[model samples]
Target: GCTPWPAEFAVRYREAGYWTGETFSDFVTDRTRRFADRLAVVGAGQRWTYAELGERSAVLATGLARLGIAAGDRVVVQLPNIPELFEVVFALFRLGALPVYALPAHRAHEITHLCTTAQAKALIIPDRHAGFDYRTMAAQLRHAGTAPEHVVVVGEPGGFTPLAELRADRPDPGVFTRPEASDAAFLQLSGGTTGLPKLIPRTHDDYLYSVRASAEICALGTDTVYLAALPAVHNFPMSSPGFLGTFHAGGTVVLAPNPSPDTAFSLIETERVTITAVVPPIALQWLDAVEHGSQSHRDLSSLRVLQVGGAKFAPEAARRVRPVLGCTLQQVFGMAEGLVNYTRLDDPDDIITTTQGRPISPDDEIRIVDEADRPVPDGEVGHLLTRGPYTIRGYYRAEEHNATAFTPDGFYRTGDLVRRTPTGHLVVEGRAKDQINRGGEKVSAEEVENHILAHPAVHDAAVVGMSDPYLGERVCAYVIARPPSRSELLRFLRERGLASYKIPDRVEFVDRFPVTGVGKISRSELRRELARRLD
Candidate 1:
C-alpha cells in the first residue's frame, strides 16, 4: 500500500498539464509504433529494435502472467546491466505488476529486507554476474523463509525457474489488466537514514512527466544515443532522462557492463554514444584516464554531453569536461523519491560547473528552511524541502517514518542542505541526514553500526564518513571492542552479507566514544577525530 497525493493537489497538477494521464504500458506501445524500426537497446552483444523490444515484453508479460504474477503483485528485480533487465522490467510494466528494483551489488541482507518488506510475490535475478553467484543468495533466502514464493533466474535456474521459460510465442496483450496512470508503477529504493532502505512508490503519470520533461531539458531526440554506464535501475540513470527518457525520445540506449573507463570508452566509440550519466567518482576516473592517455586510441568525439551526479561533483573536477573530453557537462542533483535538478545544456560555464542546476518543473515547490521550519533568506543555505507532481507523497507503508520525513501539508524533506543562487540554481552544501555518500553509493552509518554490534567481540560501534580525494566520503567505523582485529571485523561484516560498498573502508579501535555536553554520542566529534587522525 502506498500513499496518494491529496485530491486537490492531484487535480491542480492535472490541470497544470504536469500529468498527461499516460501509463507506462501506453508509453511503450505508442513509442514502439512510432519508432518500430529504430534500434531501442544494445547490450551484451545483442541489438533490439523498438518493435522487437515491445513484442518481446508483450510476450514476456504473458509468460509472467502464466507464472501467476498478476496485476498489483510485487516482484523484486535484481539484474545487471543487460538487455534482459530491460525486457523483464518492461514486461512487468505491461502486466501492471509493480517491480521493486534492487541493485546488482545488493546481497542477501538487503534483498531479504526488500522482499519481505514489499511482501513480494516473486524475486527475479540473474544466476550469476560479475563472478558472484546470486543463485546461492537466492537459495539462502529461500531456506531462511524470507524469499518470495517464486525465484526467477535469468541465466541458469539451478532449482529455480528460468527466465526464458516465461516467454510465450504470441503476445497476449489482452490477457493482462492495464493499470491506471495514478497507480504505483514501481517501488524505488531510497537512500535511507535508518537501518534499511525505504521504498518510494512512483505512479506512471508522475514518473512519465519527469521523464518527458527531462528528455526535453537534456535535448534528447531520435538521433540521441544514451550510454547507461551506471546501474540502470538507480533513479539517476533510470529517469534523470535515463534509458526511459531515451525510450520516450525514441533514442537508442547502449548498456555498459561496467562504468570503468575501458568498457565505457569502447562502448562509446562502438555505439557512437552521444550522452551518458555517471556519478562523480566515475567522472573523475574517466577524466584521469583520458588525461593519462589510457584511452588515447578510442574516438570519444561522439560523446556530446557527460552528465555527473549522485554525489557532489567538486568544482575543480567539474571544470575538466570541455577541456579534456570535449563535451558539455550536465550536473544532475536529485533523489529517487522525486525532484530532479539538472544543469541545462545552454547554461553558462560557471553555472554548469558550480551549481547542481534547477528543478524539472515550474511546479517543483522548494523551501529552504531553518531548524525551526522557518524559511531562510533566498541565498542562505538551509534544509531543502520539496514537493512536486513527480515527487512522491510518502514512501510505501512507512507511515511512522513518513510522519517525520514529510511535512504535515506534504513537502518531502530532501535531507540536503542547499542554497539557491540568484538565477535559481541550487548549490549543495552538505547533508543533514546521518548517511555516508561514499562515492555516490549511499551507505547508512546506522545500518553498518547495527551489523557491527551483532559481533560477539564488539561492545559498541559508531560509523562516520571520512574524507577521501576520489570518493567524496568513505565509511569509517570506530569500535569499542575486544579481541577482534580490523580484518576480522571486516571479514565478519562480509560474512554477514553486507554489500561491498557498505563495508567500512577503515576501522578504528577506540576505548569509548566521545559525547556532547548532553551526554549523547556525538557523531560530528567522531568525524572530527577521524579527520584529525587522517591529517
Candidate 2:
C-alpha cells in the first residue's frame, strides 16, 4: 500500500514543472493560426476547420455580449458532441464569461436546478438532440424561478433563438474587453465524487496549464488526430481529448456524439484518430464488440494512443484491451477541481490494473494525511489532499463545503484513500467512505470488488461494510452478474486466501444497479438499502 521512495519521490516530482500561465484562447488560436485550413472537427458527416470554429465562436461571443453577457458572468451550456459545443466553450472564454457545463441528458427540470445553483445569467442548448426535445420543456425552464433571460438553442430552434443562425450572418463583433489570465473562465462542477456537487471556478491561466499538462502527457502535436469519445461536458474529456485540448495542441478533434460501438468505430476509421480518451466501460465495450459484433469492420491501426478515465478499470481489463486495440494506453484520474493524474512510462501492468498514477503538473502538490490532518508514513493509507494552479481556489457558492474540503494553506482534500506502492507509484485503496473495515483493520472494498469482478460471470461489483456484533464490522458484497452463483462466489474469495476478514461474508447478485445522473454507481442508495435490511 506504499510507494518505494516516498520522501525522495516527492522531492523528485515536486521539482518538475509544467506550463502554468498561457490563456485558453491564446493557446487555441496559436494552434489555429498554424493550421487554419485543417479540419478541427470531423463528425456525423460534417467537418469544421480551426479558423472556421474560431471566427464563429468569436461572433457568438459578440452576439451574447450584445445580449448583456460580459466578464465574470456565469453562462451555462448544454449541448452534445458537435462543432457547436466546441465553439460555445471557447466563445465563453473569449468573452470572459465563466461557462458551466451540464450533460445534454438534463431536461428543463435539471436545467433549472443547475442554473439556480450556478446563478447562470445565460443558457445555451439544442432544441432537439436525438429524439429528446428541449422545446417540450421550454415552458418549465422559462418559469423555473431563476432561468436566464438570454436563451439560445440549435437544431430546429423554436422557443429559443436559433444560435447557429445568429452566429451565421454575423458582422465583425467589435472586440469586447476580455478577462485577465487569473480571472475565472469556467465552473467545472464536481464529477459526482461526493453526494452534492461543488462548483469549481477554473481560472483561464490554470485551465490552459492543465490542458498543456495533459497535452504534454499525451505528447499531443499538430498532426495528431484526437478522438473525443466521452461526452464533451465532463472535465476529463473537456480538458484532455476535448476540442479544447486538441485545439490548444493544434491537433484535430474528431467528435463522437456517443460511445456506442457504431459511432465510435466510424469516427476512429474515418478520422484516423491518433489520440482518444473515454470512460473505461466505453473502451471495454469497444474491445468486446470488435471481436463479437456482426460485420465487425473496425481497423484501428491509425490510432497510436488511447487515454482511459472516469471509472477504475480492472487490471485484467487493461491487459485484454491493449493487444486488441493496438495502442499505447494511458489512464487518467482526477477531478474538475484540479488533480489531473495518469499512469506513466516504466509503469508495470500492475500499476495500470491497480493504480491510476500521479499528477502531470509539477506545480500540483499531493499529500496523504490521516483523520487528524497529520501525514501518514510511506506505506500507510490516508486521505489525499492537493493544490495546483489549475485547481479551483474555492467552491462557487458553498461556503460550508469549501470550509471543510480545503486546508488553511489551500490544499483541496480529495477524500480518497490511497496507498503508495513499492515502485514509487500510488494505488487507490478506495473512497474513504467506501472502506469496509473488519474489527478496525480497514478493508478496501475495491480490493475484494476487484477480485469479484475478475470472475467471468460477474459484470460489476460493490462491497459495503455491514455492522456486526462480534467483529464490529463485516463485509457484504453486492454484485451485478451475468448469471453468477451467490454461495459459490463467496467460496471463490475464500479459495484465493484473500484474508478471511476481507472475503465478503455475504453475496447478493443484482441484474442491474442504480446509477447517479453522472453515470457512477450510487453507493449512498446501496448503503441505505443495506442498512435497512440489517435493521
Candidate 3:
C-alpha cells in the first residue's frame, strides 16, 4: 500500500537519477538465485525452476546469437500464453536483442506491419498451438521470398528449429553477454489501430522500474500467489501487475491459459491464488455468469485482490465484484504507450470509478494540455501530455509518427482528451487522435482507412472508433464501395491481407467521402453521421 512510503524513498524516486540497476537478465537472475527450484509457471504439465528456465533460456540465446541475432537486433515472437513465451523473452533480452510481442490471429493482420517495421531477421513461433496451422503460412512466406532468415518453432515441426530440441543442445554460457541498464530490453508492438503498428523499444532500467514499482505499490506479500487470467504477452499483466510483479516479490504466479469463468474460479480456489489481473469484459462476463447461474463452474474463494485494467470500469462495476466474487478490487489505467495509473487500495469509491487515479508515485507527473501543447487549467479537459522516468522516448522506428505523437518538449502526447481534477487526478474524456482502444490495444482509424483505400474496387474509405461496452471501442469502417457488400469488403481485406483484429467491426456502404475544410475527408463527420443513421 502507499501507507509505507518512506519520505526519503519518495524524494529519491522523484529525482529520476536514483534508479540504478543492472541489465534485465542480471536483475532476474539475481532475484531468482535464492528461489532456484521454486515453481515459476504452472501449466503444460511441466514444472520448471528458475535455474532450469535460466539455463534453457541461455541455450536458446546462444542459438539465436549463433544465428546472427546480435545486440540491437530485432526478433519477433508470436507464441501463445505458454511458459515457453517467458523463456524466449528473458533469453532475447539477455542477448540484447529486442523481442517484439506478436498477436496471434490472422497472419495478414499484424505480422506484415510488425515484421516490416522491426525489419526482423528472426521469428519465433509455435508450430501448432491449440490447433492453428502456421506451417502453411511460414511456407507461403518462404515461397514468396519474404521469410525470415532464422525461424525457431516451439512445437514439433520439420525444417525449423524445434524449440525443445534446439534448447536440448548444450551451449556454452560464455556466448551470452549481459546488457547495461540503459540497453534496449523490451520490445512491444505499436497499438497501430491508431495509425500503423510501429516498433517500441523499452530500456532495461525503466521497464524493470515499472515492474518493481507496481510490486512495491501492491505491497505484495511473499506468501501471496498471483493468478494471470489474461494473455501472457499482454504487456499490462506481463510487465506491471503480473509476471514482473510476482518475480520482483518472489511470489508465485498461477497462469490460467484460457479464460473460462468456471475454470478460473476453480484455479483460484485450488491454487489459493491471492491476486489476479483482468479487463472489464472478463469481470463483467464472470460476474454476469455468477448472477444468472450461467457460469459458477468453480467455487471462487481465497482470491485476495482483483487488479482490473486493459479498460475502464464503473466504480459500481468494481464494487459489485466484491459482494459476489469476494475480493478487494484494484483498478488499473495503463496503456501500451507508457502511462501506468493504478487505483490505490484505500481510494474512495467516487475517485476509483470516476477517475483513472493519479500517477503511481510522486515521481510520475500527469499534465493535461491544450492543442498548443501548453498545460490546461484545473478542471479543464485537454489532451494528456506526460513526462516521467517510466515513460518512453519515442517509437522504435516511425520518426514521422513520433513527430505527431509527441510534443517538442519531449513529453509523450497521450492523444487522450482528459481533465486534471482540482485534486490532480485524470478523468479520460476521449482521444484527440483517431484511434480506438480495444482492451488496451490501440487501433488506428487512419491506418485502416488507408489500407481499405488501397483496394481497387473501393472509391473512398473512412474509419472511426465506435463505443462498445465490452471492447471499449471497436473500429467501424464506412466505405464508398462500387460493388462489394459489407461481408464482401471484409473478405476482400482478408484476401488482400489485413490483420484479423485490424478488420473493421462494422462496415457501411456509401459513394463518396464527405469533405472537410482544406479538402480533407471528414472521418469525424462520418462517425457523427453514423450515430444519426443508427437512430
Candidate 4:
C-alpha cells in the first residue's frame, strides 16, 4: 500500500475538473458509442472498428472471469506490438484487474523479478517473439512454484491457454466490471537508476486527466492517424495521449512492430499516419532514410508531427526535422512516474527546437533547487522537482525509497538537472541519476554492472555513458576480472537474460578502477576516460 495525496490536492484537482470521475473503461466505452464502426486499430494484419474492439474485449473479460480471474487481481502482460495488446489491456480494464505492464524485451532477469514482486495472479505472453520461446520462461516460473495461476498465450497456444479461448466467449453486455474512478487502474514500470524497475501506481482519474490534456494540447481529432512506432506499453506512446488519446478522439492507430526506419516509414506512408513518436536515434535514422530516398516514390506528405524525446534531442538535429521530413518537430520530456511536457504546434521554431516545452497542466508545480534543496534563481541549472495533479505521490510498495525520492512537502525529486527559460520552457541540462540514455532508452548502470559482477572473471565492474553522435550515449563497462573479451562479456550478459540494449557497447579491462576521495569507484572518472579514448 502507498500513501495517498493530501485531501486538499484531490479537492483542487476535482474542483478544476481535472478528475472527471470516470474510469478508463468508461471513457473508452463512451468513445465506442460515439465512434462505432470507425477504424480504431490496425495491427498484426488485423483492423478493428471501435464497435468490434468494445465487443471483443467484453467477451475477453468473460473468458478471464470464466478462468477464475476476479477483479483486483494483478495480471502481468508481456507481449509485442499487436492488436491483441489492446484487447488484453482493455479486457483487464473491463474486469477491474490491475495489469502489471512488462516490456517484450524483458526476459527472465526482469520478467521473473516483476511477477514475483507483484505476486501476479496471472501472466500473459506471446508463444514466441523475435526467435525467443516465452513458453520456456513460463515453464521455468511454473517449476519455481511462484508462477501465476494461469499462463495466457497470445498466439497459438501450446501448454499455455490461448487468449482466443477467452476472446471467443461472449459475455453479456451487462457483465462489465466497474471500480471507483479514484481506484488504482494499473501498475506502470518505473525508469529507475537502481537495482530493479520500480512499480508506479496510477489511478484512473489522474491518468485519464493526463491523456485528455495531452490530446487537447496536440489537437488530436478523428482524422488523426497515429503511428505507434515506440514500444506501445512505454509511458510516452501509451499515454502521452498515445493510443488511448487516439481512441478518445475517434482517431486511428497504426501499430508498427519495430521503430526501425524501414518498418515505420513504410507504415507511415501506407497508413497516412499524421503523427508519431520516437527517440532521437530513430529520428536521426528516419532523417537519413528520407535523405537516401530509398523509397523514391514513397510520399510522406501525410505525416505532420514527429514527437522526439526520452533523451536530450540535439538542437541541430531538431532543426533538420522540418526540412528533411516535412513535419513539425515536437520535443517531449516525461516520465513513467507522471508529468509529460510537450512543445505545442504553434510554438516558434526556436522554442520547439531548443526547449522541452512546458508541463501539461497549469497546476504543475516545478522547482529548480540547489544541492541543499533550496530554491535556485530562475534560469540557473539545478535539480528539478515537481508535484502536480498527474505526478505520483510515491512509488508503489517502496516505503523506504519514497522517503528519499520525495520531499516532505510532496515534491518528487526528478533526478534531473534543468533550468527554466523566461517563457517557462525547460532546458534539460543533464541528469543526477546514474542512468545511461542510450538513444533515449534508459540503461540502469547499476543493474547492468550487477549482472557483470556475476561473471566469474569479473572482480570489480563500473559502467558509464560515453558520448555518441547517433545514440546520444553508449554503455561502457570497465572491469577488473578474468578480463573477458568484449564479445565474451556480451554473450555472458545475453545468457544472463539482460536485454540487448543494456549490454555494454564497449568493454575495457583495467587492473583497478579510479577511486573517489572516499575510495568508492568513480563513475565520472570512468566516463572521462571513455570520452578521452573517443577523442
Residue pairs clashing, model 1 = none
TM-score of each: 0.97, 0.77, 0.90, 0.96
lDDT of each: 0.91, 0.69, 0.71, 0.87
Residue 233 lDDT in candidate 3 = 74
251 Cα displacement, candidate 3 (Å): 1.8
**Which model scores highest in lDDT?**
1
Per-prediction CA RMSD (Å): 1.6, 11.5, 4.7, 1.8
Tens digit per residue, CA lDDT, model 1, 298-407 = 78999999999999999999999999999999999989999999999999999999999999999999999999999998999999999999999898888999999999
Residue 385's lDDT within candidate 4 is 95
The sequence of per-residue lDDT tens digits that candidate 3 reaches over residues 1-535 is 0011234643565466535665777865675676677766665666667677777677878777777888777788888767788788877867877787886664744666666667788878888755566665677667776667777887777687677655655666676667766666767875663555766777776677788778877777566687878877777887766777787777777778676787677778787888888888888888888877775555677787788876667666777877777777777777766778877767776676567767765667677778776777789889888866667668766677777776675677776787876666677777766566765656677777877888878887777667787777777777886657778778777765566677898887766544334144355666556533443
Question: On a 0 to 100 scale, what is the lDDT of residue 455 in model 3?
Answer: 80
Among all windows of 10 consecutive residues in model 3, the one with the lowest summed lDDT is 1-10
* Clashing pairs counted in every model: 0, 5, 7, 1
Question: Residue 123 of candidate 4: its Cα lDDT?
Answer: 94
Per-residue lDDT tens digits for candidate 2, residues 1-535, read: 0001133432543345333445665654566667888788776677888888777777877777777787778888888887788778777767767788877655453466568887788888878776666665554667645578777887777867778655654634464445566556677655433333456777665677677777777777788888777767778777864556777778788888887888777778878888788766577678788757642578888887777776555567677666777776777776777787888745666676567777866566778899888989988899988876556657877777677777877787877788776664666665655455453334566567767877888887767766664344577877887766777887776543344446677777766543333144365556645544553
Order the numbered candidates by lDDT, best leading.
Answer: 1, 4, 3, 2
Residue 443 error for model 2, in Å?
23
Model 2 residue runs over 4 Å out of place are 1-21, 108-110, 193-195, 293-296, 345-348, 433-535
**Candidate topping TM-score:** 1
Superposed model 4: Cα runs more than 4 Å off: 173-175, 514-535
